[PDB]
Each structure stands twice: as C-alpha cells, then as structure tokens.
Design a protein around this ligand. Structure first.
Ligand SMILES: [Mg+2]
Ligand SMILES: [Mg+2]
Ligand SMILES: [Mg+2]
Ligand SMILES: [Mg+2]
Ligand SMILES: [Mg+2]
Ligand SMILES: [Mg+2]
Ligand SMILES: [Mg+2]
Ligand SMILES: [Mg+2]
Ligand SMILES: [Mg+2]
Ligand SMILES: [Mg+2]
Ligand SMILES: [Mg+2]
Ligand SMILES: [Mg+2]
Ligand SMILES: [Mg+2]
Ligand SMILES: [Mg+2]
Ligand SMILES: [Mg+2]
Ligand SMILES: [Mg+2]
Ligand SMILES: [Mg+2]
Ligand SMILES: [Mg+2]
Ligand SMILES: [Mg+2]
Ligand SMILES: [Mg+2]
Ligand SMILES: [Mg+2]
Ligand SMILES: [Mg+2]
Ligand SMILES: [Mg+2]
Ligand SMILES: [Mg+2]
Ligand SMILES: [Mg+2]
Ligand SMILES: [Mg+2]
Ligand SMILES: [Mg+2]
Ligand SMILES: [Zn+2]
Lengths: 56, 238
RNA sequence: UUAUGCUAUCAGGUGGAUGGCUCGGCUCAAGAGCUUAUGAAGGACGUGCCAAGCUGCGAUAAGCCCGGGGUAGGUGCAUGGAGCCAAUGAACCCGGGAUUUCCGAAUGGGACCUCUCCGUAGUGAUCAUUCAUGAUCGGGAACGCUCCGAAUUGAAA
RNA sequence: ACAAGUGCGUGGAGUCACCGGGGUACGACCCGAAGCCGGGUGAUCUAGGCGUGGGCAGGUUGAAGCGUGGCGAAAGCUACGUGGAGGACCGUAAACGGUAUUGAUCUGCAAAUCAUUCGUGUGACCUGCGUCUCGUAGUGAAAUGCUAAUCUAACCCGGCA
RNA sequence: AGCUUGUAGUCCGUAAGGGAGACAACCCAGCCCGUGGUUAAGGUCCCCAAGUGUCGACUAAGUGUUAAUACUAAAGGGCGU
RNA sequence: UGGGGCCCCGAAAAUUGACGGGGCUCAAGUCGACCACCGAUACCACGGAGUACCGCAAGGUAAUCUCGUAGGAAGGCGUUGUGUUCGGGUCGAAGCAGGGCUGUGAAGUCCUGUGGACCGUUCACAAACGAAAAUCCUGGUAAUAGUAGCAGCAAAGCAGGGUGAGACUCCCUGCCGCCGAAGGGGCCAGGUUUCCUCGGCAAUGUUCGUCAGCCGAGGGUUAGUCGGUCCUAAGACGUACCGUAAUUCGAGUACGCCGAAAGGGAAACAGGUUAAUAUUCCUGUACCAUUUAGCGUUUAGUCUGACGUCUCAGGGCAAGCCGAGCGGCGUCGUCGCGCCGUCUAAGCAGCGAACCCCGUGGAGAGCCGUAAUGGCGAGAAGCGGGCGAAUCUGUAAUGGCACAAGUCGGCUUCACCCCGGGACCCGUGAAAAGGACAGCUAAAUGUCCGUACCGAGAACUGACACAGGUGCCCCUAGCUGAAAAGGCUAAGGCGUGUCGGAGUAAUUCAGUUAAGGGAAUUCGGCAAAUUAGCUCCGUAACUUCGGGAUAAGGAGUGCCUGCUGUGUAGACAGCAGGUCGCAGUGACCAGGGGGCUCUAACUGUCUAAUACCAACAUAGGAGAUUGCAAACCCGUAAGGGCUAGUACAAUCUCUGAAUCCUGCUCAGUGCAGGUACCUGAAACCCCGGUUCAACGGGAAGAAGGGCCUGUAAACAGCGGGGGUAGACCCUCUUAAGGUAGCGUAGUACCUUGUCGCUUAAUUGGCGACUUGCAUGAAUGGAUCAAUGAGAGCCCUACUGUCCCUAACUGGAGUCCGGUGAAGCUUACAUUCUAGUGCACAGUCUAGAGACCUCUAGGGGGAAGUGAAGACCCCGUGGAGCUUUACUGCAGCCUGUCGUUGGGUUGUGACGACCCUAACUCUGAGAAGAGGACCCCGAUAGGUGGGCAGUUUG
RNA sequence: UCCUUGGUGGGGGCCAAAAAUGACAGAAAAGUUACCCCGGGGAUAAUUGAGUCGUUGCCGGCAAGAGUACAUAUCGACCCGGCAGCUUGCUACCUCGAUGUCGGUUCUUUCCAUCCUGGCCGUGCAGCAGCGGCCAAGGGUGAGGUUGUUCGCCUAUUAAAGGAGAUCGUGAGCUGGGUUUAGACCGUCGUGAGACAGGUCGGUUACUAUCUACUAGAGGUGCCCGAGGUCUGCGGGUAAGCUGCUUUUAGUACGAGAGGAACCAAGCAGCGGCGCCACUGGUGUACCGGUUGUCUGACAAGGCAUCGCCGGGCAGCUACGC
C-alpha cells in the first residue's frame, strides 16, 4: 500500500461542511468554526492584514 | 528546539498520556463525617476496581448513602463497618490513629483530619502505628519513613486487600499490555539511547550510549532532568 | 513525365499577430462621508409564458402603491414566437411608503442538519434605571486612537 | 602656547535653474534558491489514545482439572478416557502485511500497480463509524518515520520586489 | 611536462588579407572603397599560377620530400659511399 | 691514423593512412651558388568616401590619418504622444506580401496586389521608446508519425433473421462461452438524476456504432409501523465566574446543550399495481403511541434496557437433501430416467425445555447427575405445584399458481434464534432515555426530513469508462472434498476486465516438453524442478522437559460384489473376495529433507514510495526521585496532566528471556551530603566624602564555588621496558592496571595467520591455537532449547542454472482495416581513416568511398535522451544536531524589600520561640489542619545547550 | 568648558605618556552532517582523455667477470643511452545545466615485445629433451575450487592453456558481487553531534531509435534498338580449414647402455566451417488410446479442468544424428 493513488480512495468523508454565514465550504466539522469567515468562533468576520499586501 | 520529552508531553495532557477515567468504578475516600459524629454501614458486595487492580467494597451506611470503600483484607459481605472515635478498633473499621494501639496495621491513612485517605492504598500495603504523643503519632509507612501524623487522622484497620499481586511475573508483553490499557501509562516505552539527538538528551551517536553522566542535578530545567534524577548514589549494593 | 526531393515565388487551408476602433482600467484633483436588534452587510434557496448564467426582487418575489419630472411607446445584460402593459399617462429617473422566506450581530433551545424542536407566542448575553423603558453587540476602501510586537536585511561576518 | 618653525586662511564671486554624466540610501537594469520571522489551516491520508460495532473458511496439537484402573507397607509412581489452555501450529485471492523473482510495467492499469512466491491469520489481532492530540508543536514498538503525493521543522498568506 | 612561477621585447585577447595541409598568438602584413601594375612571405612535376630551370657534387636508404615549433628518437657502431 | 658530408644498423603498438595526396632516383631528395617567373587588401598610380587640424569662406595639408574587445566621446535612424508650422485621405488612410530607387547604414520614399478609415510633416519636447538569445513568458504549430498504445491480470465469439442510407460491434433466436463464497443479492459513506420513455450521433466511448452511465426533451421518489427524530458514550459546544495588555484566546468549576442512519430503541405483515415508487400507494388482516371522556387503583421500589473473551450441551428453524402420489418441460439410436412445482405472512388463542422458587421427603461400609466441571443433613434422590423460551399447532381462508396439481412422510440444519453450564483475567468488559408491575371501552390525532438510481474491473475516490483503494461490509445453491480451498455446474449477472482481420519471419511477455550429464552455471542453487492429502508403522542430536516432530525413513489408497461394528440417527470405522490401468490424494489441491555456525530469546514493530534486518519493542534484571500541598511535567495566568492514582504506586533511566555470572579504579567529569575555614552580589548597618547624593571603604554573609566525604548496574577507564631454565626482586605506576570468560571474532592491520575435517583443487564453512594493530562483564560477558521471508557452509533429492540448445502453445511483433499521442530538434547531414583544433571531429585539412527511395532487425556512434551533479571545491549562503566555542534567555536555588500582625526571652535592628487575626489547604457548611511561614510581585547573585542567535578566518 | 547668572562636588575637552588587537592597515568567536539543502565552478579534485616518464614493462652500448680453459653456448656487475604508455606518480589543458563509475558475461577487431603451431641459426646440440636468438600475427590460447575481484594461488587436462590495446573496448547489451547514499552492529577515535583510505548485514538499473553505421529483403531511375536467356569478371570475402592421438617408418638412425627420432603413408579424434533428415534422439497443443473430478438424465457421444493428467506418435523442424 502507498501514499499516492492507493490511499486516496479513502476520501469518502468530509472535514468541512458548507457554512451558514457565508455559504462557503469551510465550516470545520470538528472545531465548529468556518475557516473563511470565522462563524462559530466570533461574531465579527475574520479578516487579517496578511490576507492582502502591505499598501506601500 | 529539540523535541520535548515524554514527560513534557505527559504534562501537557494529551490523549496518549491521559487516564481512562470513565473505566474506573469510583473515587475511594472515607465517608464524610461531622466532628463528634459516627455512622454504621454494612458491606453489600465486593467488586473489582480497574484503577487499582484490587477489590473494593460496596458499603451501604445508615443514612442510605451507598459509598464505595477501599477493601482491607478479610472484609466480607454482610460485615458491619463503623466510623468515628467511638468505633471499636477492628479490621475494616475507620477510626483515628490516636486510638489505634501501637503495633497494629492500618491503611488508607489520611494526611490531615477528615482528609479521605491518602497514604497506604496499594494492593497489600500497610502501615504500622509506632508511637503516641499528645500532638503527634508516628506511623511506619510502606516505604519505610516514620511519618508523623495528627492524632485525629482516620485510617481503616488492616492491610489493603489484594496482597501478592506482583508475585506473578508478567511473563508476556500482552499481559502487561492489557493491564496498561486501563492505565494512564504509555506502553511500550522506547529507550532513550535508541532515540535521535533531537528527541532526548541521551539520543544520537554511532553507537548506543548516553555520552554524558546519567545522574542529573536537582537544579536541572524541565526537558533535561532525565536518567538518574538527583541520585544520592548508584549501582547495586556493593 | 526524374520518383522521394531541394530552394524561391504564387494560390488555398490552419492561425490570430500587426493595423484601426473601444461602453473598460489606472493615476491625480474636488466634493461628501457612517450604517446596524424599527433586524444591516454578506450568504443559502426561491423568483421570468417559453429563462440556463449574471443582475434585480422576496411567497405582493426582473415586482406593488403614492407626490414630482418625462411623454409614446415599454416588456434588464439579450430589438426571438405569442401575449401583456400604456392617453385612467406606463416604461424610465428623484423623493416617500408597502412587501421583505431561512441563516447571518442572529438574539426562545439546537446545529457536519442554512433547516429543525418546543410552543406556555419568545427582551440571548452584559448593563443603567423611577424597574415605565433604554444602551452595547455586526459591517465600513483606507484614515484615527490605545496596547502588544518579530525576522529577513544593513554594518560587505 | 614659552620659543621659533609650519598648518589653514587673507588683494570681493557666488547663487538659482534647464539639459546631462556620476556617487549614496531606498525594490534600484531584469530574472534567479535554500532559508529566517508573524498570523492562520490541516489528524478525510498517515501515527497514537478513547467510545461503540463487525470479523477471523476448515483442520491440527492436546496444558491444568475430573473419572476409572494398575504399581507400592507407606511416601508416592503410573496408563487410558474425558477436558478444551495457549501473544500455540497448518491454512485460503476472508482480513492484514509486503519476502524473492532484483520478473512484468517503467512517456505504466498505477506519480509504486500487476503476476508467481511469501509472513501473521484467537490476538501486543484486523477493521467500519465517532471523537481527541499539531508546527520548534503532535504522534512515533524510534526510521529523523508519519502529520493530506510535502518533513533534520508541514501547508496557506504576509514581512518579500 | 602543452608543468609551475618571473623578467625584456613583440604578439593573441581585440588582428583582417597572403602563405605554411589544417594552425588564437610561426613568416609577409598591420586593413576605408573600386580599378590597373609590381612585389613581400613562400613556391614553380601534377593536384595548383609560375621551371620536368642552370651549374658543381652527394644520397640508393622511398632515407628524404617537416623553417620556428607542445607537431621532429638517442648512446654506440659501419673494410656503406 | 685524424677531421668532415650523406646514408645505414641500433629502430617494437595496438580501426586501414598519411612527404598535405599522387608520385619522384645525374630527382620532383640533401648541400654550395645562380637565373627567370608566379604570388597579397603590402608598395606605386588613378578616381572616390570618411576622419584630424587650420582657414571667415572657397578651400589647404596628412610618408608622418583610416584594424579593433572592455570602455570614454560625438553625430544620426526609428516607435508613441504633446506644443507649434505645413498638410494627405472613400478619385481610397493605416496595416499586410513582393519588387524599384536613394542612403556607408539605421531607415526613408516609390510601384504592384489587398484593404475599408484614418494618417503624416517643419521647429522643439517627453517616454510604459527599438530584441536574436534569459533551460526567458503567453499563444499557435511542426518533425518524431499515420509511429507507440488500443495485447500480458477474465485469450469470445459464430449462423440465420431484423432494423438501418450505412452493421464484427444494436435487437431476437439458436449454438459456444466467463463469473458462479464473486464479476450474483442487500445496503453505509459518497455521487446527485447517472434512474425510466422517446429522439439523435458534431464531441465523449481506446475501433465503428443505428448502441450508450453521452447529447436533447419529458417523467419518476407518496410512511404512525423502515430509518432519522428520542437517549446517552468517547468527546465537543454555549452562558456565567476567573485569567489575559486584550480578544474571536485559555484550564477548571456550576448550569445547560449537542454527540451514533452499524450502541440503546413502542408498533406491519402477505399479495397486487407502474415505464420508473413501494413493509410507504391499493386489497385483506392487524398492531403501537399521545391526548379527551367514562369506569378504579399504586406494588414505588425494584426489575429490564444492560453488557467482555474462549469453549460446550439441549431445543427450534431458514437453506439443503431423500421416498410415495399428482401436474408440466427435456430426453427418447436403446433405456426410463432428469428438471421444475406440489405454496400460506404478521396478528390473535393455546401448550411450554432449561434455570429458579415453594410444599413434602428422608441419603452414607455412600448415593444422584452432566459433554465436562459437579450436588448433598447448612438436607441428595423421588413426588407434587408455581414462574417460564425459541418454535409448533389452530385461525387469519382467500391471496397469488395457466382457476395444473396444490396432498403427504423422513433426514439434516449451519455461520440464525432460544436456553443453560464451565473456564480466564495484575484485562472486570458503558451510560441514559424507554419499558413491566392498574388497567378496560369509545373517538380523534400521529407534524418534519430521507425514500429514485449506482454502491463499484463504467455511476464513490485516485486528473480518466484508472488492473489501486473505499467493500469482501453483510448474505450466497448442487457434486467432489475437512472446507466458504481449487475444479465443474444452477440461479443471477454477462460475451464491455469496449478494436478487429491474417496465419508469413526474426525478436519478445507468460507457459509445456526435452535425450545423456546433474550445479560443471553463478557473487550465491537466483529462477525452475522435486515432495505434497489421509491412515498406519517409526522417528535422532539437543532441550528451558514444554519441545524438536509432519523430524528423518517407510507401507497402503481406485473400481466392483458381499458384509460387520458404534451411534437413537445422520454418518463414522473396519473386513473378505474379484478386477482394470504405465499411473488409484490418477485431474484440481497439496511440506523437499537433513547437518554445522553467526546473530536476536520467542509472538510482535519498522524507513507508506529502493533497507522486514542482527535494528525497535518485549517479559526478566537493576538503579534513581518522591510520604501526596510529594517526585516529574504543562501554563503568562487562571488553573492543570500523572490522578476517580498513593511506595505491591507513579515518574525517570540503563540492560534485554532462561542458565553460569557481573572483577579492579572515586584520579577526571557528573551526582548527593557535610559544610570548620576561604571566596561570594544587592538591601540593611558604620566610617570618609557630598551645605544633600553620586562616590570610596569597612562590618556581616545567603545560594553557588573552593574544600572534605560517599557514589561505577553514574559518564567512563583497566599499561609499556630488561632479564631467569618462562612460573621471579622492580618497573611504566599523575585512580587502576583487564578477573571469570571469549579470541584471526559481525571486533584481527600484518592476512589468503598456522594446524585438522570438508573438496582433485576452497582469499570459504566448521574445530583448534591465539603475541587481542584495536575483546571483556547490565558501555553487560559467555551460552542457549524453541522460533526466524535474517547471514554463511555442507550432504541428499531435484531439475534447461549449465554442457547446448531444440520443438511446441497463448499474447505481442511482422502484414492488413479503423482510431491515434509523446520525448531529443541552431542549421545542414550518404559516410570512413588520419591529422589539427580547449589535448575525444559526420561539417575543419588531406585522402578514400558514396546512385536514390522504402521495409525489417538488434542497438556500434551521434562524448544519444531524461537533469542548472547528489562526489570534490568555493560562497565572509543556509538548516538540523552537539559541546568544558561566544553572547544570552526560560526553568530551578538563595539574600533583601512588600504582602506581614501581636507577646517572650538572647544581643546591638538580628536569630529563635509562642499565639490567632490576615493568608493558605480541606469540606456544602459547622468546623479541621498549617500560619505570619509558604505562594505571589520586584530586585541581587548562582546554576543553566532546557532554549535562542551567531561564530568557527 | 558644562545648557539664565555666581559658587561647591562631579563630569566633558585640548597636547603628551601607558595598557593590544602576532590573522600584526587591528571581529569580543568551537565542531558536525553519509539526513543534508541552495548558488556556482572543469576558475578546482575522484573520473576517462591529452602532456611528461621519476617509477613500471621491454631493450641497447661498453663488456668487469662466472662458465675446468675461454667476456659474448649460457648469466651479464658498475656506468651510460633508449623505446612503449599496457602499473603507480606528477600536472591541471578538456568535461561539474553529469561523457552512468570496478569485476564478470556476450560479440567483434587490433599490436607483436610469439605461449603453442610453421621456417631457421648457435650450443658447453650424441639421440630424446632442453637452453638462447632471428623470421612469422594464418589459426589456437580451454574447463574448474576460493575470492566481488583485476592480479595471484590451487586442480586436472592440454600443442599451449601469451601479454596488451579498442573512453582501464563493450550497462539506449546484460549482471549488480565490491566500492560511493539514506538503516543497523562490532572495534578504534571524539566530552559530544559524529568519523574511520576498518570489517559486517540490507539496499530502485529510466527511454516507443530522429540521423548515421552494419545486417538482410524490395521499388525506381542511370547504362540501354524493345524483351528474354546464357556467360564474362572490374572488384569484395574467406581459416575454410587449424591441431593433436595411434599404427608404419622403427624399437631402426644416435648411444657404452638405458633411452630413442625424422621424410613418405594410413586411420581416428578435438575445435571450426558448410550442408542434410535414410538412421537414432527431442518436440510434435494434427492424431490415437487410458483415466480422475464435474456438467449435458443413463449407455453412447461430447464440454471444461495447463493438451485436465498419463501413454504412444506420422509429417515437419532440429541435434544429441548424418
Ligand atoms: Mg498596511
Ligand atoms: Mg540535546
Ligand atoms: Mg550584514
Ligand atoms: Mg607650554
Ligand atoms: Mg486426549
Ligand atoms: Mg498461518
Ligand atoms: Mg505525505
Ligand atoms: Mg514569501
Ligand atoms: Mg611573435
Ligand atoms: Mg595587437
Ligand atoms: Mg592569418
Ligand atoms: Mg566599445
Ligand atoms: Mg522572439
Ligand atoms: Mg491483433
Ligand atoms: Mg466456472
Ligand atoms: Mg468513435
Ligand atoms: Mg442526540
Ligand atoms: Mg527477533
Ligand atoms: Mg533491542
Ligand atoms: Mg562492573
Ligand atoms: Mg561455493
Ligand atoms: Mg551547477
Ligand atoms: Mg571572502
Ligand atoms: Mg545552539
Ligand atoms: Mg541574522
Ligand atoms: Mg540517522
Ligand atoms: Mg553501449
Ligand atoms: Zn463561513
């Protein structure tokens, strides 16, 4: 058995579900937090200054 | 940062090093009794405690509080358990050590009054009441230390049940594996010389050896205090 | 009639450069500058006679009503068939309203379930108070204030 | 600083622009690595712990215990039957693993698979689903192995031109 | 040692054209374009333009037909001539 | 005899070859001279260009100017646009292909063709301003090439008739086949319409195709009873408290809430119906829950839900099988057999086997039992009674069956259900909802979600219609057979593990057979071959007494006739006679065996994707820390892991079963303790200084260090030289000189050490000796039965491994029809030799060969392709790791200040003592135990590779 | 001189002297990497190649002498001069955007400095058998045990069982035994990570052939009255054979004896070459027979299980035959 195509047929399950707040498939099913908008962790939307570049 | 030791992983509290707390029957402690109070109870059954690999007695008291108790040797079903200072010095009874005659055996000793029992709890261990004084009382513990305890520290008379458990050799890695399933301990354990230098202080090299003295100081930091920690001496008895 | 070929040109194919155009973009300047529990932004689903995407709208669903402008056509990007709307002044633009499913600060409990359970019909949490009522919660391109806070790199180490 | 010698300066020409050359710092003619640091992502793969389930064709061997009978004065010795123990044995193209052919294939069926030959196959077993442990951190019966085809320090974006 | 490290001059690097079979730096030559002429180096039996050239000898081994040279064998011997 | 010229011997090299080749002999060689000619861009001359300087300009001079890399300087050409001048264009602008002319050239202008709307120029000015190249980037497109692939693991199709314009490929029929314990049936996750009907074939399908999981259109999923829903588990999430500079961040606590489509669980079955739905819709017959009403009650605390692994008895049943009758089909050369069917659910009513309980009973020179263990005056057997299963019987009885029979007996029954026993555990094998004990009758209500289809060699995942994985997850019939193995057949699914024809080489992938020899092959028996099932006889060394063991070495085996024994029975075991063959486990299936060493005890684990090992782990042994407010560890903190724990424990290490053992060294380093003396920071105190301090000293002195002691199953170490016939006086002794053992080793340089067995011969194997470059005792030593896909050697058996290859089979290849890529490539290229050239040339130089094109072949060459070398060096490039490198930072130890109070003595503020009242811990609290200590904030010193950044020229 | 002014303590400064960086035109500074990574280098090494030849292999001159005598049958000191480039060196010219690195195997070729076969000369050659030298590259030069080996030893044959070159010929041919990765053990070093030109066990061999070369098979044109047939021979190739054993010569020549040849002739054998299938052997999935298990209802006839397995075998092909 290998790490390539042999063990990639075990991908019959999910770790991210479609989040309510943003409709993106980023809601982790174990931590209960969307990794795109942060629903289930915070009221505000997660946005960081490293998501774009320094404006200079 | 060379990788943290097994002790640091255990102290962090990961699932590999956590005790399976749901497997155990009940926390063992003496029943809560107010000062100048007592309660009677009878044994309704001898069960098996996975936390200690020794029997524990299910005792039903007079106020109806079904409480698991640590089983001294010889305790049976239908026996009456008594607590308090007025309780007779009898095997299985919970009394202060200040009333126990010197030379008797006690177990599940309390560090402080109304403690619930800390010392002398393994399968078969016992303590000896050495001396009585007004503020103190000496008990010879299973290690050998003459610990000085308060005269009001309760204890159940007799040696702890399940004596002789370590007499049988393990004889097979599966038997110890099955014991360690219900334990918090990690099984099996890799020797530190077989580790790489990133993992342990003693790892690495072209051949299996520590390269440094295995007796480590008491003032060592965490992640370095391995081997023989703060040894008074080493080796077999010459 | 010398095939397979070679070189130069010509005609055609494939191809989409050059040229021309352009309702887009970028940069600079000048104004104006908050919104949200009276439920936002954002999202899911629905929504068209024939309608898949986008856009708009929300079971009144590419829409409804009222005051002003405009006036002969209208029926989105996207002048197809058949109908409909409009001189009771539409379409379109400005202003004021109505409707505005579910989630979302999401707020009666619950989310791998954008739905589900209780219905005794919902003010969840933290607060102020006369305990009538009220505040905060989220979003906003950057700017503003407070606090926490690296390394690459330069010194030719 | 006393002295005498000499240094620098002194008999009025600079300043501000346009077009240029060059030096210096900033991404500084353009492209080119391993890396270092901040914040987030990942245990659908794989490693380990836990909860709850499912599995292991068909045979073999025959531990303790028990019954009956022999041998002895006793102590004890002993045969057969029964018994169903074991990280026991053989064994499947059940399952798991992956020895040798250094065969096939190597712009493959396949970014490691196929054939024959093999190891375990009642247990330190295999495995479904659930849940947990993670980046100087986790896990590791320890190879620097594994942590989503990536590991002597992952991946994504940012410091970064 | 076609090695390494200096010194004087001249070269290649940065050097055409002509000639050594080809030759970075060996000889003529330092070179704007076209034409005519004559020479340099070197060659004149053919390949190849011009000598089967002249005089006096040597070599008999295909020796040789190889200025410089990283491209060319010595010591020794020969009543070979 | 000496001095000379040329030549000769000395004189041998590897593809055929080099005076440049032909060839040349009073020369076409050598020497001394000579003549004439050839031959450069030089020199001369003529005409022209540019440059340098001078001249106002015309122009003047240059034998004394004209080559050119890095580079400096000057002058121009071109693209796009701005200001400004002058303009061109549907009587045809830009751009594009070719061509003429000008210019040294950059480039400009003009002409021919096409085109359908803009485009230049003077003088100045700006720039996202000029490409041939960066393994440059994006796009398009070649050569390879009509080539490889469309083959290997399941070699599958043929005849007739259709449909169709078109048929190997689609449909029907027959024949021949594949799977048949999976390629069939059911469904989880996942997919998401792939499901079903109709119409098409531009793309998809490894060919075509009228076919299709494709394209287009339409349709399809119906629940009180199946699941979700409800319950709780491992474990998440929320609010509050608390922490944090702060949070969306963090452990714990309290209250909640979620967490399983395979755990628990209230209840439905049979038949019909559609193209696709069916325990859901329809027919029949039922059942469950909640609420409302009528009739009365609690027993209310228990039981059930509810439990591991192994083994086994008894009972039932699906499936299976046999005999009789009955109804159809097949066969029918002869026979009378073979196959199919002969059906019947839940619900309702009834009986109830074991176990358990109750009333009697009276059992010992012992009796009653089970498969087995067992039971008994603490009361067995026996007799009654109660509680009590699966299934069975009766009804449901009319449903479907061609309304064709439809009725009966027997055997067996798993792996399914009920019930009971036993054994094991240093494993003890879940909880909660729900359910039972007071219910009976009536009526109404039972919302929401899923329901199609695939579930995999084509519906999932791996880029794919992927030989993998997910799933072999749960079921699977007849014969053989121990069997679910393998072979042959049902049912069921398929001829789609989606290219065909053809039979003609070499070569190749996988097989069959091979005389005589039998490992002579090879690094090595790698590969292949041998043996193989069952019964019986028999079985060695050695051993931990368990084993080795299927050791080894042997015999039998079919079929037919007739019987016996055990069992209730299925079935099992055995015997006599006859008989066929080369062969009776006739195919399939199925160990070759043994001996001596090394190593590890063993089962296990391991570098997924080159290492299945002797490495890791293991039980066993030993050591160390810690009395629990602990040791060890995490966190900044709040608070935590170990821990629902307590020395028979947890944590930290070394060694690695058992057997015999484990010697000396504490000098170095480490650790622990003692601390008399020395050193030792800050605060406090005293002196000097300061109109005050900074500052300089003194006193005292914590931890730490020096110092002394213990410690080696702590890190570690355990020696040479001279003699004596080599057993002694001494050495070399900065602690000690290696004991038991083992020894050319897995360690041994010399080395292929020396001797014996093994072989004709052995750098080998084993045994012995061993002066050991450089063995040795938990850095564990020696040794070891058993085990081992481990590493060597030997014997037997076997064989195409070989002598030495041959023939045959299937798939490729060759040829043909269809489909159809990729990789190398500056250009040219029909080469061969030698030389030269950066010293390894198809392209240069000189020769020699060579007509071109195509097919097949295997690979000589293209220093063939893959690829910015991984070996070596360099880089004031990195990373990881180490440490008595440099500099630091956590952790830990300790003095002082604060927290921090009250009384007593001994001193001049210091040390001790006592108290409770802050504070800490425990408990829900009463209260209990410590207590001004500890913890905590700050500061001073130490230890400190635990961690960080760097350096190591 | 010290930040408004004056002072006091204490700092700052000018000039000069001392304290040191020895890597001495001045960093406060240890290792390891085979777990390694990255940027480059033929600016620089292992590698092949080229140059050179100390060393290695092979020789020559002069002959000092030994050889009973006698330098030169044979050996050839000292000293001197060479060739080859086949051993090890030296060097750094080519290659680090790789020329796949030892040994074996397969196949082809080349040099002669010849081991055997062929021809001679000398001898201190009686014969047999040696010894030394010259010519000669047509053929031959093998099978085995250890070792990864090259080399070397050993075994029995043999005419002999030569050496060397071809990128230490030959990995788009093979093998993978050794060396040169990642794992592990032993010993020795190092406090340690780790290292050893020490040993041991284990350890991935990628490619569809464009051009050229060769091997064979065809299609064209060129030459030519048009076609056919039979020949010639410019040329190309060969090993088409090479070598032993026995008999005869002859137990003769020679020799005191033992021992013991050659010329001619014959047969057979080893290897090589070419060809063939009467005989023998192999195969022979055409075919025939026996038989196991199972299916088609039984017999008969058939399917499948490697041709199910087993026995036999014609033709064909082929060697082990001729
Ligand atoms: Mg910014
Ligand atoms: Mg360390
Ligand atoms: Mg710097
Ligand atoms: Mg002075
Ligand atoms: Mg028995
Ligand atoms: Mg097995
Ligand atoms: Mg990975
Ligand atoms: Mg970056
Ligand atoms: Mg010169
Ligand atoms: Mg020059
Ligand atoms: Mg020249
Ligand atoms: Mg220049
Ligand atoms: Mg270009
Ligand atoms: Mg074919
Ligand atoms: Mg079959
Ligand atoms: Mg097609
Ligand atoms: Mg739930
Ligand atoms: Mg082992
Ligand atoms: Mg081990
Ligand atoms: Mg010792
Ligand atoms: Mg051998
Ligand atoms: Mg490079
Ligand atoms: Mg430098
Ligand atoms: Mg460090
Ligand atoms: Mg730095
Ligand atoms: Mg390592
Ligand atoms: Mg080759
Ligand atoms: Zn989201």
């Amino acid at each position: 058995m290998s790490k390539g195509t042999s063990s990639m047929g075990k991908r019959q399950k999910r770790t991210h579900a479609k989040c309510r707040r943003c409709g993106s498939v980023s809601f982790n099913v174990h931590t209960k937090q969307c990794t795109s908008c942060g629903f289930g962790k915070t009221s505000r939307m997660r946005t960081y200054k490293w998501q774009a570049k320094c404006k200079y | 940062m060379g990788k943290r030791l097994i002790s640091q992983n255990r102290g962090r509290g990961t699932p590999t090093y956590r005790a399976p707390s749901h497997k155990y029957k009940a926390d063992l402690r003496h029943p809560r009794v107010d000062e100048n109070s007592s309660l009677r109870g009878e044994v309704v059954g001898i069960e098996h405690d996975p936390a200690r690999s020794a029997p524990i007695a299910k005792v039903a008291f007079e106020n109806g509080e079904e409480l698991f108790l640590l089983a001294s040797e010889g305790i049976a079903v239908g026996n009456i358990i008594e607590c308090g200072d007025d309780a007779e010095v009898k095997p299985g009874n919970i009394v202060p050590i200040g009333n126990v005659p010197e030379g008797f055996f006690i177990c599940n000793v309390e560090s402080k009054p109304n403690d619930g029992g800390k010392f002398v709890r393994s399968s078969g261990v016992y303590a000896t009441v050495v001396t009585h004084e007004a503020t103190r009382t000496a008990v010879s513990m299973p290690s050998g230390n003459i610990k000085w305890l308060n005269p009001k520290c309760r204890a159940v008379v007799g040696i702890v049940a399940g004596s002789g458990r370590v007499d049988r050799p393990w004889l097979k890695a599966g038997k110890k594996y099955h014991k360690m399933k219900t334990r918090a301990a990690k099984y099996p354990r890799v020797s530190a010389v077989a580790m790489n230098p990133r993992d342990h202080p003693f790892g690495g090299g072209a051949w299996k050896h520590p390269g440094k003295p295995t007796t480590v100081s008491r003032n060592a930091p965490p992640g370095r205090k391995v081997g023989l920690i703060a040894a008074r001496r080493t080796g077999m008895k010459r």
